[PDB]
Amino acid sequence: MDINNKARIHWACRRGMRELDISIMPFFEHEYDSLSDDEKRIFIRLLECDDPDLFNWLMNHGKPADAELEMMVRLIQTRNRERGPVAI
Protein backbone atom coordinates (compact mmCIF):
# COMPACT_ATOMS: atom_id res chain seq x y z
CA MET A 1 0.00 0.00 0.00
CA ASP A 2 1.57 3.34 -0.92
CA ILE A 3 1.13 6.98 -0.28
CA ASN A 4 -0.77 8.27 -3.36
CA ASN A 5 -3.72 5.93 -3.51
CA LYS A 6 -5.77 7.90 -1.09
CA ALA A 7 -8.95 5.86 -1.63
CA ARG A 8 -7.18 2.63 -0.65
CA ILE A 9 -5.67 4.25 2.45
CA HIS A 10 -9.12 5.70 3.27
CA TRP A 11 -10.53 2.20 3.24
CA ALA A 12 -7.69 0.98 5.52
CA CYS A 13 -8.80 3.70 8.03
CA ARG A 14 -12.17 2.02 8.58
CA ARG A 15 -11.63 0.10 11.79
CA GLY A 16 -13.62 -2.57 13.57
CA MET A 17 -13.93 -0.28 16.67
CA ARG A 18 -15.92 2.97 17.29
CA GLU A 19 -13.24 4.86 19.28
CA LEU A 20 -10.79 4.22 16.49
CA ASP A 21 -13.13 5.22 13.71
CA ILE A 22 -13.59 8.62 15.29
CA SER A 23 -9.83 9.03 15.65
CA ILE A 24 -8.09 7.58 12.57
CA MET A 25 -10.58 8.34 9.80
CA PRO A 26 -10.97 12.09 10.48
CA PHE A 27 -7.20 12.43 10.98
CA PHE A 28 -6.74 10.90 7.51
CA GLU A 29 -9.47 12.99 5.86
CA HIS A 30 -8.23 16.29 7.32
CA GLU A 31 -4.51 15.71 7.92
CA TYR A 32 -3.02 13.13 5.58
CA ASP A 33 -2.17 15.55 2.75
CA SER A 34 -0.27 17.77 5.20
CA LEU A 35 2.16 14.98 6.09
CA SER A 36 5.63 14.58 4.65
CA ASP A 37 6.09 11.59 2.40
CA ASP A 38 7.96 9.85 5.19
CA GLU A 39 5.05 10.50 7.55
CA LYS A 40 2.58 9.10 4.99
CA ARG A 41 4.58 5.85 4.64
CA ILE A 42 4.72 5.47 8.42
CA PHE A 43 1.00 6.16 8.77
CA ILE A 44 0.28 3.43 6.20
CA ARG A 45 2.32 0.99 8.31
CA LEU A 46 0.51 2.09 11.47
CA LEU A 47 -2.74 1.05 9.73
CA GLU A 48 -1.46 -2.57 9.57
CA CYS A 49 -1.28 -2.78 13.42
CA ASP A 50 -4.15 -4.53 15.22
CA ASP A 51 -6.99 -2.46 16.73
CA PRO A 52 -6.30 -3.46 20.37
CA ASP A 53 -2.82 -1.94 20.03
CA LEU A 54 -3.91 1.20 18.13
CA PHE A 55 -6.53 1.88 20.79
CA ASN A 56 -4.05 1.45 23.64
CA TRP A 57 -1.57 3.78 21.88
CA LEU A 58 -4.18 6.45 21.10
CA MET A 59 -5.33 6.30 24.77
CA ASN A 60 -1.64 6.43 25.91
CA HIS A 61 -1.74 3.05 27.65
CA GLY A 62 1.92 2.71 26.82
CA LYS A 63 3.22 3.14 23.28
CA PRO A 64 4.75 1.30 20.30
CA ALA A 65 8.29 -0.02 20.57
CA ASP A 66 8.79 1.25 17.04
CA ALA A 67 9.70 4.94 17.43
CA GLU A 68 8.28 5.84 13.97
CA LEU A 69 4.97 4.39 15.00
CA GLU A 70 5.20 6.21 18.34
CA MET A 71 5.79 9.54 16.53
CA MET A 72 2.82 8.92 14.18
CA VAL A 73 0.50 8.04 17.07
CA ARG A 74 1.52 11.29 18.75
CA LEU A 75 0.95 13.32 15.58
CA ILE A 76 -2.57 11.92 15.36
CA GLN A 77 -3.18 12.97 18.95
CA THR A 78 -1.83 16.46 18.43
CA ARG A 79 -3.71 17.11 15.19
CA ASN A 80 -6.96 15.60 16.48
CA ARG A 81 -6.75 17.62 19.69
CA GLU A 82 -6.45 20.89 17.78
CA ARG A 83 -9.19 20.13 15.22
CA GLY A 84 -11.83 18.72 17.51
CA PRO A 85 -14.50 20.32 19.75
CA VAL A 86 -13.33 22.82 22.37
CA ALA A 87 -15.50 21.88 25.37
CA ILE A 88 -16.38 24.24 28.29
Curated annotation (Swiss-Prot):
Example of a GO biological process term: succinate metabolic process
Keywords for this protein: Chaperone, Cytoplasm
Species of provenance: Escherichia coli (strain K12)
Family under the similarity heading: Belongs to the SdhE FAD assembly factor family.
Function as written in the Swiss-Prot or TrEMBL entry: An FAD assembly protein, which accelerates covalent attachment of the cofactor into other proteins. Plays an essential role in the assembly of succinate dehydrogenase (SDH, respiratory complex II), an enzyme complex that is a component of both the tricarboxylic acid cycle and the electron transport chain, and which couples the oxidation of succinate to fumarate with the reduction of ubiquinone (coenzyme Q) to ubiquinol. Required for flavinylation (covalent attachment of FAD) of the flavoprotein subunit SdhA of SDH.
Keyword Cytoplasm: yes
Complexes and interactors: Monomer. Can be cross-linked to FrdA and SdhA.
Pfam families found in the cross-reference section: Sdh5
Cell location: Cytoplasm
GO CC, alphabetical: cytoplasm
Phenotype of null mutants: No aerobic growth on succinate, 80% reduction of succinate dehydrogenase (SDH) activity. Significantly decreased anaerobic growth on glycerol fumarate medium, 70% reduction in fumarate reductase activity. Low covalent attachment of FAD to FrdA or SdhA.
InterPro entries (UniProt xref): SDH (IPR005631), SDH_sf (IPR036714), SdhE_FAD_assembly_factor (IPR050531)
Lineage of source species: Bacteria, Pseudomonadati, Pseudomonadota, Gammaproteobacteria, Enterobacterales
Name this polypeptide is given: FAD assembly factor SdhE
NCBIfam families per UniProt: PRK10878.1
